[PDB]
Design a protein around this nucleic acid. Structure first.
Lengths: 82, 106, 97, 95
DNA sequence: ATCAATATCCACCTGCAGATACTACCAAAAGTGTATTTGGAAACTGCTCCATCAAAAGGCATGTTCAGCTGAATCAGCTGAACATGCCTTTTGATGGAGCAGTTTCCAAATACACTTTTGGTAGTATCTGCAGGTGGATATTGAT
């Protein structure tokens, strides 16, 4: 039953997010569009975090790596350090 | 008595860039490679944009690059456009771009 | 035999999820996705537990807010159904496109 | 009669390198000068932050390098990183 | 399609504003060269906390059915584009003076040690409790007729 990783971000999950977003009715094509969007988001953020990792000569991405990445992407996060 | 710029094979002023790094309060110390590397990136970037602006000047039967040409250069180039995506080039205008549905008949 | 009208449960779900703050994506699948994407940047990476968590929090915040703008875009067009063009218009105006 | 530095003569040099028969208006030059200062500030800034995050008090060509990678888009970074590595290597072997 | 109004496109054309030039100087850069300090890489290692996996948990893929939403088609009403007209307001070039900015003198305030005292963070241990879940029982909401 081999399944793609992005597909593990499921319909009901995306539905739930839209819900918190206050979305009442969702077109069937949203689920694929949302996956695309999330992928571009994660690439952009992860790319930067890992770049921080490589700079520190580590093999572990630290929450601070992620937090610093988010800050320079203009998506500042509170809760995980810094 | 050779400048560090020539030592690195650069037109941009390594001396100056070493200095502005100190005066600019970025860290306690500045390593000697730093301004060389930066001046190089600085020179590369400016080459890339002048190449492209030069082309817009020529595309326009002009010999002298004006702000419009820099704007054409930057906006037409995906990467320079991202780098400068929140920057305004005075006297640059915009790229010709009309939305489809706006054009006449069908 | 008992049946709720289309959008009755939806409303009820808006209310539920707006009240709570739990993450709405299952941890594991999200975790793999994170690792898969990272693999293309550097290989044999390990991830602090909190690191994945931070990424998820950020990702969910992001998507939940993008759905609000998306929804505004659907409503602007006098619909009540979010469509990709709505996500597309929101992202373009946000300057992400 | 105070001294106001710019990157103008240097922009002009590079200009001649790439388009030997093309000139540049003073307003275009001004913009050029602004762009260099701008990118200087953004790189130096990340470099600054980067150092701090790693409890380092020195900004080395390595810091600048991560900064360039963090700041510049895909292909510009790749090429900037070459050009800078190159300049350093050449600078190292030259005294 | 053909006829005609009017915009659009070059091409060449003079003036000239802005660019390029040069000659002389010079203050502050930038370099050079010497003595003095140290930041961080390199190497060893202890113990978190991470990937893994086996057993327990419980969310989701699935296909059907039809409510109700979206988008097409149609159309009347009126808003907004075009353009003509009559003339006000902005643009452009010329001339006294506010305040920025450049230099120098001087002291209140901040850096640099160094030593003496404390506080804030960890940690081991033990100590404490707000509330997430579960229950049970009433009442509200929604949908069917």
């Amino acid at each position: 039953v081999l399944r793609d990783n992005i597909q593990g971000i499921t319909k009901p999950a995306i539905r739930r997010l839209a819900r918190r977003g206050g979305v009442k009715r969702i077109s069937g094509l949203i689920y694929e569009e949302t996956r695309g969007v999330l992928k571009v988001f994660l690439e952009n953020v992860i790319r930067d975090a890992v770049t921080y990792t490589e700079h520190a000569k580590r093999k572990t991405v630290t929450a601070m790596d992620v937090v610093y990445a988010l800050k320079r992407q203009g998506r500042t996060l509170y809760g995980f350090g810094g | 008595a050779k400048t560090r710029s020539s030592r690195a094979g650069l037109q941009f002023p390594v001396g100056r860039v070493h200095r502005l790094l100190r005066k600019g309060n970025y860290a306690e110390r500045v390593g000697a490679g730093a301004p060389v590397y930066l001046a190089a990136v600085l020179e590369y970037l400016t080459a890339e944009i002048l190449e492209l602006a030069g082309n817009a000047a020529r595309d326009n039967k002009k010999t002298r690059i004006i702000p419009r040409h820099l704007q054409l250069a930057v906006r037409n180039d995906e990467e320079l456009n991202k780098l400068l995506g929140r920057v305004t080039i005075a006297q640059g205008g915009v790229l010709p771009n009309i939305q489809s549905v706006l054009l006449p008949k069908k | 035999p008992h049946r709720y009208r289309p959008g009755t449960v939806a409303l009820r779900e808006i209310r539920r999820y707006q009240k709570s703050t739990e993450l709405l994506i299952r941890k594991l699948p999200f975790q793999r996705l994170v690792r898969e994407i990272a693999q293309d940047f550097k290989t044999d990476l390990r991830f602090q537990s909190s690191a994945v968590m931070a990424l998820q929090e950020a990702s969910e915040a992001y998507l939940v807010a993008l759905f609000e703008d998306t929804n505004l875009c659907a409503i602007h067009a006098k619909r009540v159904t979010i469509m990709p063009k709505d996500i597309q218009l929101a992202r373009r105006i946000r300057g992400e496109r | 009669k105070t001294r106001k530095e710019s990157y103008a003569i240097y922009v002009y040099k590079v200009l001649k390198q790439v388009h030997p028969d093309t000139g540049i208006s003073s307003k275009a030059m001004s913009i050029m000068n602004s762009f260099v200062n701008d990118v200087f500030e953004r790189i130096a800034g990340e470099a600054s932050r980067l150092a701090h995050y790693n409890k380092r008090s020195t900004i080395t060509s390595r810091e600048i390098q991560t900064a360039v990678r963090l700041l510049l888009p895909g292909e510009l970074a790749k090429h900037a990183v070459s050009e800078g590595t190159k300049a350093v290597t050449k600078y190292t072997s030259a005294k």
